[PDB]
Structures are given as structure tokens and as C-alpha cells.
């Protein structure tokens, strides 16, 4: 091939000819950092509707997650790739077999929805009617119909869920994967980020010159733009929950965190050799449907980070191959 393999032997243990189909949505998340989520301890409500989830048992947060890098460039094509942080380059990311290859390789329904950027390469080698610009309405080129909600006309994260049941019914008795790539918390102009319903921390900084105003009223943004998440997650979840012909998941990470003034840094994208904890300590959820068949798997003793989702996906799509040996994945593998 073109392509540089590492998992040419993947074949997928069951089917759905033999059992239920799958069905997973990765979100990937944008800009959140792991101590402003209130279910690590932050003292104030930034997740309500995960946090309900987390007491019922049905959301399990994996704690302080360390993201590969600082900006999505660089760690979105490293959280879908075999390499792993300390052997990926972004320069060269194109020119290896990702996860997205193999899953469409055996067979699984792929969708990507982005109002964030692009895939970063990762969809590529996929049909182009496989990835959804999101960051534009219908008129603008793209096919987000919630983008007028807010003066800015900025497109929503809520609106990558509208009708995803048109995939589900497109592709019946298939195993299906949908990646939402979010918009998220992503600044500087976080008051841009979330509609009114979720201003809820006040006063809030209305300028991108974020050293000029006062920094609790920049966190107080950065916060709503958390709650809008947290009820995009609840909304996603309240769709899957009505997916009961499929065994369901939802993983969510962020591809890294945000500095917010400490030591005078703000922002992200810092070379990962220097960057502060705050850049690299994201939040991590995954969501088990009704009746799961799977597990969540032991801890890291350092705890985890982007170098589990490659193995997850291929656990929850019950493809073995010889690349997720050693490695470690959210969900154990089922036998
Ligand atoms: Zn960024
Ligand atoms: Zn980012």
C-alpha cells in the first residue's frame, strides 16, 4: 500500500450477524481542562448534567487525563493515531494507517461533523461525504442549521446532533462510529462560545485582550462555555440512550487544556516540553449504554491520556489486532 500499516491483521472478532450492533460517539472536545470540571473537585457547577451521571453510576470520569499536546493541530491527529505520543510527528502524521483507516477497513460506518477546523488529516483517506463541515450553515457551504441563536452567527456544538438518526437508518445492521469535533471552549472571545441560556457566571470579559480584564470575569466565561458542553454531552447521551437496537457508548476527551492566567500564561499551544500542567490535564468520560457488555479497565499509574482512544475504539468495536497489545485502552477488550 501507500499507506504505513500497523494493523494489517485487524479482523473483528463478532459482527453485528451475530450480535448487536455497536454504536459509539467520540466527541472530541476542545480547549477543557480537567481541574475546571466540578466532577475533579472545581468548586463551582461546570458540569451539572455529567455530574448527575457520574452519582447514577452511567458516566464514568477518568480523572486527570494528560492530552499528547497543546493546540489541535498537533493532538488531534495523535489521539486517532497508532504512534502515541512519544513517537508521533505532526509532520508526518498523513503518511500512517490511523484508527479511522482500519475501523473503515473491517467495515464500521464512519461520520465526522466538525465545527472546530477539519479532521487534521485524519479522515483523508476516506470518501469526503464521510466529513460534514460544521462550522457554517447550509448557505455558507457548510450544514449546521443552529448557527443564527447569538449575534456573533457563530455555529453551535448542539447543532452536529441534529438527525444523526439519518446515518442510523442509512447504515442498518452495521456498526457505526460518529466523531463530533467540537468548538468547545475554544478562545480567545470565550463570551462567543456558549448562547444566553448559559451566561451564568457573571460579569464575563468581553474582549479577546484577556490580560486587560479581570481575570475571575475571563474564568467566569471559560465557565460558561463549560456548562454549554456539558449540556451538549447531556443532549448526545439522551440520543444514544434512545438507541436501544445498539450497544451504545460515548467517549468523551479534549484535545488539551487552557492556561488561565497562572504565571501570567494564557491561552494554549505552548511546545509540549514547556507548556504548563494547565495545557496538558484535559477531562475524560465515557458513557455505557443500557444492558453493556464491556468494562472499564484498570488504571494507569500515572492515570490516562489521548494514547488510550486508539485502543478504546478498537476494543469497542471488537477488532483484535497485534497493535493494541501492551497497550492501554478506557474499555478492557471483551474475550
Ligand atoms: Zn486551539
Ligand atoms: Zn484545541
Not at 447569538?150 to 447543532?159: A, I, L, S, T
Not at 478562545?187 to 480584564?213: H, I, N, W
Request: with cysteine; net charge negative; proline share 4%.
Amino acid at each position: 500500500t501507500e499507506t504505513i500499516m500497523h494493523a494489517n491483521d485487524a479482523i473483528q472478532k463478532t459482527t453485528a450477524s451475530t450480535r448487536k450492533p455497536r454504536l459509539v460517539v467520540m466527541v472530541v472536545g476542545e480547549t477543557a481542562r480537567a481541574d475546571h470540571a466540578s466532577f475533579n473537585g472545581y468548586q463551582r457547577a461546570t458540569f451539572p448534567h455529567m455530574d448527575k451521571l457520574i452519582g447514577l453510576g452511567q458516566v464514568h470520569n477518568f480523572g486527570n487525563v494528560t492530552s499528547c499536546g497543546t493546540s489541535a493541530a498537533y493532538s488531534v491527529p495523535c489521539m486517532f493515531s497508532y504512534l502515541g505520543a512519544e513517537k508521533y510527528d505532526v509532520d508526518t502524521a498523513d503518511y500512517h494507517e490511523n484508527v479511522i483507516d482500519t475501523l473503515d477497513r473491517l467495515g464500521v460506518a464512519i461520520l465526522w461533523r466538525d465545527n472546530n477546523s477539519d479532521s487534521k488529516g485524519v479522515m483523508n483517506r476516506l470518501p469526503a461525504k464521510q466529513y460534514q463541515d460544521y462550522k457554517n450553515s447550509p448557505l455558507q457551504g457548510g450544514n449546521n442549521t443552529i448557527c443564527h441563536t447569538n449575534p456573533y452567527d457563530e455555529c453551535r456544538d448542539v447543532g452536529m446532533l441534529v438527525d444523526l438518526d439519518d446515518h442510523v437508518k442509512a447504515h442498518a445492521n452495521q456498526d457505526i462510529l460518529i466523531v463530533l469535533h467540537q468548538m468547545g471552549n475554544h478562545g480567545p472571545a470565550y463570551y462567543k462560545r456558549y448562547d444566553d441560556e448559559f451566561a451564568q457566571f457573571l460579569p464575563v470579559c468581553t474582549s479577546s485582550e484577556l490580560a486587560e480584564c479581570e481575570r475571575q470575569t475571563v474564568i467566569n466565561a471559560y465557565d460558561n462555555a463549560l456548562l454549554a458542553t456539558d449540556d451538549f454531552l447531556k443532549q448526545t447521551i439522551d440520543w444514544l440512550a434512545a438507541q436501544t437496537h445498539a450497544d451504545t457508548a460515548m467517549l468523551y476527551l479534549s484535545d488539551h487544556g487552557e492556561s488561565l492566567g497562572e504565571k501570567g500564561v494564557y491561552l494554549h499551544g505552548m511546545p509540549k516540553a514547556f507548556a504548563p500542567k494547565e495545557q496538558l490535564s484535559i477531562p475524560a468520560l465515557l458513557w455505557l449504554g443500557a444492558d453493556t457488555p464491556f468494562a472499564v479497565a484498570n488504571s494507569p499509574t500515572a492515570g490516562f491520556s489521548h494514547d488510550a482512544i486508539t485502543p478504546t475504539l478498537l476494543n469497542l468495536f471488537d477488532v483484535s489486532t497485534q497493535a493494541t497489545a501492551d497497550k492501554t485502552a478506557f474499555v478492557n477488550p471483551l474475550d
